[PDB]
Amino acid sequence: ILTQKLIDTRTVLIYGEINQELAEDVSKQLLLLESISNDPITIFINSQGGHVEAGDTIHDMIKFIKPTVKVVGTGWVASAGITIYLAAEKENRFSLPNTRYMIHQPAGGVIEAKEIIRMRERINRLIAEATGQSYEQISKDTDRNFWLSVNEAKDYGIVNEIIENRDGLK
Amino acid sequence: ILTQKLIDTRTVLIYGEINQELAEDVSKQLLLLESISNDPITIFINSQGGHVEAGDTIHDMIKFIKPTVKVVGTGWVASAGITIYLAAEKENRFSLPNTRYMIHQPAGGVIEAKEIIRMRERINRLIAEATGQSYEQISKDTDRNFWLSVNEAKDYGIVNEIIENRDGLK
Amino acid sequence: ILTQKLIDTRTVLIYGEINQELAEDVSKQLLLLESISNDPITIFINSQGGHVEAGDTIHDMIKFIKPTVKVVGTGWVASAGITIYLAAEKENRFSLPNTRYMIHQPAGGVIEAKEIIRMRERINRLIAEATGQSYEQISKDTDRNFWLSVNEAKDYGIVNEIIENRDGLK
Amino acid sequence: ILTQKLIDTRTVLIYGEINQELAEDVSKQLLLLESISNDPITIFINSQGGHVEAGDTIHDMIKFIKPTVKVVGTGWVASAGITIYLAAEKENRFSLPNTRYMIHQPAGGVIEAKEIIRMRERINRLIAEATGQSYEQISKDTDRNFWLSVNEAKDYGIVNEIIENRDGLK
Amino acid sequence: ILTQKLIDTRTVLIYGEINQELAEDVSKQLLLLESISNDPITIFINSQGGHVEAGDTIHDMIKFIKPTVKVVGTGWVASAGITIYLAAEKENRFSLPNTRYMIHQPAGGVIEAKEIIRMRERINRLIAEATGQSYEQISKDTDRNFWLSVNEAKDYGIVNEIIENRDGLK
Amino acid sequence: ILTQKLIDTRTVLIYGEINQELAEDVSKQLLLLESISNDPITIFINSQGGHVEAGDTIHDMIKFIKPTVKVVGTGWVASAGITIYLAAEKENRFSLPNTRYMIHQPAGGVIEAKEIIRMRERINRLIAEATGQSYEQISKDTDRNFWLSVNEAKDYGIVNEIIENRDGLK
Amino acid sequence: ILTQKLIDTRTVLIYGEINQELAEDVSKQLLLLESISNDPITIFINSQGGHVEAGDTIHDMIKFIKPTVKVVGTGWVASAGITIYLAAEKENRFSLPNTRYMIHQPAGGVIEAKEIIRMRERINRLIAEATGQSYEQISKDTDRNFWLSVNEAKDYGIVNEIIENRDGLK
């Protein structure tokens, strides 16, 4: 009854390091919610990032499932966490007020130099398409370490709407 | 029946270090209680603080949900714990008698100097608005380590009402 | 059925170190029992003490809840454990025969000198009011390490009644 | 059904080190069995001893509860384990054949010299009253390390009856 | 109801290191799903590889069971993970867009030289048959470390179809 | 249903080191099975031995309970494991074919010299009575390290019947 | 329902190191399946071997129970794993295609020289009888480290039938 009603909220929490264990847990939750109904799913994300391949799986699983996914950034959203956040369509990307964002991507993906370049190009294109920023702007910003405030992240094209209450997530 | 009646009390305990794990647990409890009814929720807080981003999430989740949240400070409330405590509206902020308060915030948030400054400014404004104290007073006090007694915390604008029994939380 | 009938006894055990984890567990049990009925609760305490803030929470939670709380000291009751024990009204403070008591309080509370003094003064006043001893007597005794026998603890005003059987807890 | 029928036997096992964790587990079992009925309880004890305060609690809890407690020594019963064993009335103290007994008590109770003496005097009187031996005999024997065979423990007044089968525990 | 509906999706996740523990878990899931119905099973694979013998078991179990197995590569698929991936028939081999592939096989299988050669020959033949590539091409590529993009893996004969949404897995 | 039918077999497994933890688990199983019915119990023993006092408890508990206990040696049965094995009556002592036996007993019981001698004498008499061997033969053999084959253990009087199939345990 | 239907498959997995813990788990599963019906049991074995006495128990338990046991080798089957594998009758011994076999037995059984010889002779005779190979051939091969391919293991008399699909296990 308790977990059953927790499933009824169609909410997924992605808090902490992005790793294969978290990717499995999130994948299971998303597949379970998909099998129940086509109703929208809300994901709250508080993550500093982690492993690139785990971030890739969560990103792709979000786009793969039939239900529309809304994301709500909270606390911080960085690196592989940003990749996950940007899986949702622009109009479905929300933020709580006390959140900072960083698109920096680890070079190794925390592998040869040719693969580091390929990985970077792939992620740069992903972020560019999702935000509406040019490839060159993203390429510069993924290779440095700067935090964006919630308002700056909105101006950047990461966050679409800043919300404080439930009625903003209508 | 046991956990079901524990949920009926609409009570959340925030005891110990503020971290992403605790933030997830608290977020789940708050979302679960919200889905059940719009009835008020009581949070008992005993925390020395912890990670800024986890504190930010809990703070924002308290304000995000529809139910009115009452907070009861107990033992100690410090740093990131203070940020969480101050998420409730002033008239909903209570304290048990044997509690001390400290608004000191860790510089690193336990990151570049520019971001340390930004983080401090954000938290200073948050605490100033919640307490009614000036920005300058808060800015001074977050950058030093001094404990306030329950009575001093009341005079400071952190605690609204000191309670010993159930009837005080009417 | 097993834990359900265990809850029917309205008994809470406080055995071992006083820490935030134990404080959370005890808080949950007390709140759960309160929500069921206003019937009295019995707490058996076997503790060497621990963390001051955790002791403060348990002490205050005992006084906060509506049900009358009876305490039964067993084995040993010391330091933060004494603070918890003294939360119950004098006529509700019992002891099993093979128990020793020590009111010694750790200076750091196991923090600046001004806060050590404040903490000590607060706890001294708490113990003085509960036992009926003068502030000066308590102040002397919290700053030294001496064990009281069950009979001496009774004479001191800590224990009200020494009991061996069930009929003594009528 | 399995644990429910295990509770129907009204049997408690005290195997291994006497510590606060074991004291809590045993206390819970004894209180649970008491709440069910006033029928006798059988305790099988295999213990080298442990912490004095934990032994004191179990000893006192055995005497505290309404049901009559029978004890069956098995393997070994020593030190704090002896204190627990002697909580039962003499005619309710049994032993399996392959058991050895030692009344040696650790000086520190595994604390000032005055308290070591007080502790020893208290435990000496306890053992003297339970066994029927003089204080002087017990005082000598608690301060040395000698094992008694099951027959010697019977002659000493520790064990009342040596049993091999169920019918002996009638 | 929750795990029951999770089983209804007939989905298996192979995330992380390929070891005997994972092989047991996957074997149990595949056998359980087979016993329920002959309906198709979908496996999502995110793995860097691991132990050759565990990979061999999962590969063979996929081919052993009656249900048709579809595989979906996600994040990365390498080494022993590739061996597992290639257990499915070519037309049942899918990939999510953000995935890289590497057919490199560890020489020791992470054992004498004669057995290293035998192992390599066996795996080379397996990969050659599944992909349609010549033995010589596979032999070269398993003995070097190069990552294939999702498009290159498709051209290589590893991936048959790249999918972004549910409708592509019709 | 699964553990319920596992209890219906009235089978207890004693595999691995003989310690107080295993003694507690075995004691609980034997008492549970006794409370259900007076039907025979089968114990499979694969043990190198362990702690003497734990072996003594299991030995005595086997003889204490009302149901007839059959033992089946498997793999190896040594030291404290032999003491347990010999708790069953001779005609109820079976062995699987691939089993070796050793009656060697550790001097310390893995304690003063006088107690080492007493312990050895007690165990020697126990083994002599169970096997039908003279005290002198047992005394020699417990103080050396020699393995008996299943056939030699039968000739020694440890094993009564060697069985390969179910029908031999009629 | 999930584990209940998993039991309906009458399948046991022996994956990883052969130890007393695994022997207990396998023994419990085999006894449980035997108590349900006399229907055949299938065992999938992926094991490098381990402890001789644990292997002996599993081997003997397979032969002891009434149901006919079929074995399926997968990944690798070596040493103590080979002993277990050979417990099944020749016509019930199957292999998945990607499996290697090694009959090497550790001298110590991973103990005096006389016992090493006895152990080796016992295991040599066991393997000789099961495979149809001469004692001399087995004696040579257990004392060296050489891997057999699935086809070589078939020619050796270890594997009877190589299967790829379900219909081969008819």
| Residue partners of D104: CB distance under 8 A and separation at least 6 | D78, D79, D141, D142, D143, D144, D145, D146
- Sheet of D69-78: strands edge to edge? D11-15, D41-47, D69-78, D93-102, D161-162
Q: Residue B147 gets which letter from DSSP?
A: P
DSSP, residue by residue, A66-131: SS-EEEEEEEEEETHHHHHHTTS-GGGEEEEEEEEEE----SS----HHHHHHHHHHHHHHHHHHH
Interchain contact, D15 vs F36, CB within 8 Å: no
Interchain contact, C6 vs D32, CB within 8 Å: yes
Give CA–CA dist C14/F28, Å, rounded: 27
Q: Which residues of C touch D60 (CB under 8 A)?
A: 74-75, 96-99, 164
Angle between helices B52-64 and B113-131 (to 10 degrees): 40
Q: Provide φ and ψ at G83, rounded to 5°.
A: -60, -45
Q: Which of A65, A107, A100, A97 is nearest to A81 (CA)?
A: A100
Q: Are E137 and E69 in contact (CB under 8 A)?
A: no
Angle between helices E113-131 and E52-64 (to 10 degrees): 40
Q: Which of A123, D30, A126, B26 is nearest to C13 (CA)?
A: D30
Give CA–CA dist C45/E63, Å, rounded: 62
Tokens of residue F126, six digits: 């126990």
Tokens of residue D132, six digits: 């029927």
How would you class C56 by CB atoms within 10 Å of its CB: exposed for 0-12, middle for 13-18, buried for 19 or more?
A: buried
Residue F115 CA: distances (Å) to CA of B11, F5, F118: 59, 45, 5
Tokens of residue C112, six digits: 């600046």
CA angle F30, F36, F40 (to 5 degrees): 60
Q: Are B104 and B78 in contact (CB under 8 A)?
A: yes
Cα diameter, chain G: 52
Q: Are F39 and D81 in contact (CB under 8 A)?
A: no
Q: Which residues of E touch G2 (CB under 8 A)?
A: 3-4, 7, 32
Q: Residue A168 gets which letter from DSSP?
A: G
Radius of gyration of chain G (CA): 16
Q: Do chains B and G touch, with touching meaning 3 or more CB–CB pairs less than 8 Å apart? A: no
Residue type, D102: M
| Residue partners of C155: CB distance under 8 A and separation at least 6 | none
CA angle B34, B39, B43 (to 5 degrees): 75
How would you class D35 by CB atoms within 10 Å of its CB: exposed for 0-12, middle for 13-18, buried for 19 or more?
A: middle
Tokens of residue A168, six digits: 């903003």
**Number of helices (H), then strands (E), in chain A:** 7, 5
In a 13 Å sphere around the CA of E149, the CA atoms on its Cβ side amount to 12
3-state secondary structure of C15: strand
Q: Which of E109, E119, E129 is nearest to G100 (CA)?
A: E119
Please give the distance of CA D162 from its chain centroid, rounded to a whole number: 16
E strands in chain D: 11-15, 41-47, 69-78, 93-102, 161-162
DSSP, residue by residue, E31-66: HHHHHH-S--EEEEEEE--B-HHHHHHHHHHHHHSS
F165 shares contact with chain D (CB less than 8 Å) = no
Residue G65 CA: distances (Å) to CA of F3, G29, G39, G51: 19, 11, 11, 22
Tokens of residue E152, six digits: 């290159």
How many residues comprise chain B?
Answer: 170
Give CA–CA dist C53/D40, Å, rounded: 42
C30 shares contact with chain B (CB less than 8 Å) = no
Angle between helices B20-36 and B52-64 (to 10 degrees): 10
- Sheet of E161-162: strands edge to edge? E11-15, E41-47, E69-78, E93-102, E161-162
Q: Which of A42, A30, A28 is nearest to B31 (CA)?
A: A42
In a 13 Å sphere around the CA of C45, the CA atoms on its Cβ side amount to 36
Residue type, B15: Y
Give CA–CA dist G40/G91, Å, rounded: 13
Q: Which residues of F touch D94 (CB under 8 A)?
A: none
Q: Which residues of E touch G8 (CB under 8 A)?
A: 35
- Out of B51, B59, B79, B95, which one is annotated catalytic? B79
Q: In this structure, which long-range contacts are made by residues A131-134, counting pairs with CB atoms below 8 Å and at least 24 apart in sequence?
A: A131/A86, A131/A156, A131/A157, A131/A158, A132/A90, A132/A157, A133/A157
Give CA–CA dist F73/C164, Å, rounded: 49
Q: Are D46 and D22 in contact (CB under 8 A)?
A: no
| Residue partners of A49: CB distance under 8 A and separation at least 6 | A17, A18, A55, A78, A79, A80, A81, A82, A106, A110
Tokens of residue D161, six digits: 């009856």
Mutation pick from F7, F98, F148 vs chain G, by most beta carbons of G within 10 Å, is F98
Chain breaks in chain D (C to N over 2.5 A) after: 110
CA angle A18, A23, A26 (to 5 degrees): 115
Residue type, E58: I
DSSP, residue by residue, G135-165: HHHHHHHHTS--PBPHHHHHHHTS-SEE-SS
Cα pseudo-dihedral E74, E80, E82, E84, rounded to 10: -90
Give CA–CA dist E117/E107, Å, rounded: 8
Q: Which of C71, C103, C99 is nearest to C85 (CA)?
A: C71
Question: What are C140's strand-pairing partners?
Answer: none
Give CA–CA dist D3/F41, Å, rounded: 19
Interchain contact, F63 vs D2, CB within 8 Å: no
Interchain contact, F23 vs D75, CB within 8 Å: yes
Residue corresponding to tokens 């081997």: G59
Q: How many CB atoms lie within 10 A of CB B10?
A: 19
- Sheet of F69-78: strands edge to edge? F11-15, F41-47, F69-78, F93-102, F161-162
3-state secondary structure of E18: strand
Give A143 to chain E, closest Cα distance, Å.
20
Resolution (angstroms) equals 2.0
Q: Residue G9 gets which letter from DSSP?
A: T
Give CA–CA dist B8/C32, Å, rounded: 9
A3 shares contact with chain B (CB less than 8 Å) = no
In a 13 Å sphere around the CA of G122, the CA atoms on its Cβ side amount to 22
| Residue partners of B1: CB distance under 8 A and separation at least 6 | C4
F3 shares contact with chain D (CB less than 8 Å) = yes
Q: Which of C4, F35, C36, C2 is nearest to D33 (CA)?
A: C2
3-state secondary structure of B45: strand
Give CA–CA dist C12/E27, Å, rounded: 46
Cα distance between the two ends of chain B: 26
How would you class A53 by CB atoms within 10 Å of its CB: exposed for 0-12, middle for 13-18, buried for 19 or more?
A: buried
Q: Are F59 and F93 in contact (CB under 8 A)?
A: no
Q: Which of D98, D115, D114, D106 is nearest to D149 (CA)?
A: D98
Active-site residue set of G: 79, 104
F5 shares contact with chain D (CB less than 8 Å) = no
Q: Are F127 and F142 in contact (CB under 8 A)?
A: yes
Q: Provide φ and ψ at D74, rounded to 5°.
A: -150, 135
Residue C104: active-site member: yes
Q: Which of G150, E15, G104, C56 is nearest to A28 (CA)?
A: E15
How would you class B78 by CB atoms within 10 Å of its CB: exposed for 0-12, middle for 13-18, buried for 19 or more?
A: buried
Q: Are E103 and E142 in contact (CB under 8 A)?
A: yes
Mutation pick from G70, G74, G79, G99 vs chain E, by most beta carbons of E within 10 Å, is G74
Q: Which of C89, C57, C121, C115 is nearest to B97 (CA)?
A: C57
Angle between helices G52-64 and G113-131 (to 10 degrees): 40
Q: Residue C87 gets which letter from DSSP?
A: T
Q: Are E68 and E41 in contact (CB under 8 A)?
A: yes
Q: How many CB atoms lie within 10 A of CB D38?
A: 11
Q: Which residues of F touch G57 (CB under 8 A)?
A: 15, 44, 46, 74-75, 96, 98
| Residue partners of D140: CB distance under 8 A and separation at least 6 | none
Give CA–CA dist C43/C73, Å, rounded: 8
Contacts E–G by Cβ distance under 8 A: 78
Give CA–CA dist A116/G77, Å, rounded: 40
**Number of helices (H), then strands (E), in chain D:** 7, 5
| Residue partners of C130: CB distance under 8 A and separation at least 6 | C86, C87, C90, C157
3-state secondary structure of C46: strand
3-state secondary structure of D40: coil
Give CA–CA dist B31/B25, Å, rounded: 10
Give CA–CA dist B46/C54, Å, rounded: 8
DSSP, residue by residue, E59-126: HHHHHHSSS-EEEEEEEEEETHHHHHHTTS-GGGEEEEEEEEEE----SS----HHHHHHHHHHHHHH
Q: Are G12 and G29 in contact (CB under 8 A)?
A: yes
Give CA–CA dist F83/F61, Å, rounded: 12
| Residue partners of G125: CB distance under 8 A and separation at least 6 | G135
Q: In this structure, which long-range contacts are made by residues F124-133, counting pairs with CB atoms below 8 Å and at least 24 apart in sequence?
A: F126/D98, F126/F59, F126/F83, F126/F86, F127/F82, F127/F83, F127/F86, F127/F103, F130/F86, F130/F87, F130/F90, F130/F157, F131/F86, F131/F156, F131/F157, F131/F158, F132/F90, F132/F157, F133/F157
Residue type, D21: E
Q: How many CB atoms lie within 10 A of CB E52?
A: 25
- Out of C47, C59, C79, C95, which one is annotated catalytic? C79
Q: Going from the N-terminus, what domains does chain G have, and what CATH number goes with each?
A: 1-170 (3.90.226.10)
Give CA–CA dist A154/A100, Å, rounded: 11
Q: Are A42 and A70 in contact (CB under 8 A)?
A: yes
Residue D49 CA: distances (Å) to CA of A11, D53, D69, D79, D81: 52, 11, 19, 5, 5
Give CA–CA dist F55/F110, Å, rounded: 11
| Residue partners of C113: CB distance under 8 A and separation at least 6 | none
* D18 Ramachandran zone, left/alpha/beta (phi>0; psi -120 to 50): beta
A113 shares contact with chain E (CB less than 8 Å) = no
Tokens of residue B141, six digits: 């006090």
How would you class B97 by CB atoms within 10 Å of its CB: exposed for 0-12, middle for 13-18, buried for 19 or more?
A: middle
Residue corresponding to tokens 């009402």: B161
DSSP, residue by residue, B52-95: HHHHHHHHHHHHHSSS-EEEEEEEEEETHHHHHHTTS-GGGEEE
Give CA–CA dist A104/A144, Å, rounded: 6
Radius of gyration of chain D (CA): 16
Cα pseudo-dihedral B135, B140, B145, B149, rounded to 10: -50
Residue B129 CA: distances (Å) to CA of A164, B114, B138, C78, C154: 16, 23, 10, 43, 51
Q: Which residues of E touch G48 (CB under 8 A)?
A: 53
Please give the distance of CA B91 from its chain centroid, rounded to a whole number: 14
Q: Are G50 and G77 in contact (CB under 8 A)?
A: no
| Residue partners of E160: CB distance under 8 A and separation at least 6 | E90, E91, E92, E93, E94, E154
How many residues comprise chain C?
Answer: 170
> How are beta strands B69-78 and G93-102 bridged, if at all?
unpaired
Give CA–CA dist A84/C155, Å, rounded: 67
